Write a protein that binds this ligand. Structure first.
Ligand SMILES: COc1ccc(-c2ccc(S(=O)(=O)N(OC(C)C)[C@H](CCN3C(=O)c4ccccc4C3=O)C(=O)NO)cc2)cc1
Ligand SMILES: [Ca+2]
Ligand SMILES: [Ca+2]
Ligand SMILES: [Ca+2]
Ligand SMILES: [Zn+2]
Ligand SMILES: [Zn+2]
Length: 158
């Protein structure tokens, strides 16, 4: 089983943007979230400008083109597909949510992106509450990766 990427140079394309944050702040949150996973895998993550990228990132609302619609404010925050072709590996963010970074209102794009990118590398949800892959958003200033996350990603990639 174990869905995983079968190449090391993973490419990504930011297909569109939310207006909740500066373009540069969005780019960097995504870059940081990839940096998390880069460090503990044999994968590199390169930003490209191409619909052929492995991980296509999209901000969307309601039906946004994949038949899995978002649900307005609250409920779903984001979803991502495990490794593979096409829609597989892609990460979508619900722009009916308020996207932010600091403590306060809205959801940390960085933290939600780090969780989504976990899925996009092949991780399912964890049963360990403190875990990045635990299916509960919580804002933190602490290091996001937990042993269980690293255990999980090593299970796939070595
Ligand atoms: C500690 O830092 C964080 C940050 C964010 C999250 C997080 C992210 C999304 C959701 S959700 O509410 O949209 N929703 O999940 C609910 C239903 C539990 C979607 C559900 C959609 N979903 C899955 O159930 C799932 C299972 C396995 C792979 C990929 C997915 C996926 O995209 C989600 O999990 N997105 O990642 C919730 C929490 C968790 C921890
Ligand atoms: Ca929502
Ligand atoms: Ca893809
Ligand atoms: Ca929004
Ligand atoms: Zn989607
Ligand atoms: Zn999830």
């Amino acid at each position: 089983g174990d869905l995983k990427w079968h190449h090391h140079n993973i490419t990504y394309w930011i297909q569109n943007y939310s207006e909740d944050l500066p373009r540069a702040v969005i780019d960097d949150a995504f870059a940081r979230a990839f940096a998390l996973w880069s460090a503990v895998t044999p994968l590199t993550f390169t930003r490209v400008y191409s619909r052929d990228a492995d991980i296509v990132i999209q901000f969307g609302v309601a039906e946004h083109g994949d038949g899995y619609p978002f649900d307005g404010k609250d409920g779903l925050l984001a979803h991502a597909f495990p490794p593979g072709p096409g829609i597989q590996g892609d990460a979508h963010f619900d722009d009916d949510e308020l996207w932010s970074l600091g403590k306060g209102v809205g959801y940390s794009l960085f933290l939600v992106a780090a969780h989504e990118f976990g899925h996009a590398l092949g991780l399912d949800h964890s049963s360990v509450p403190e875990a990045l892959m635990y299916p509960m958003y919580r804002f933190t200033e602490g290091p996001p990766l937990h042993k269980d996350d690293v255990n999980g990603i090593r299970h796939l990639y070595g």
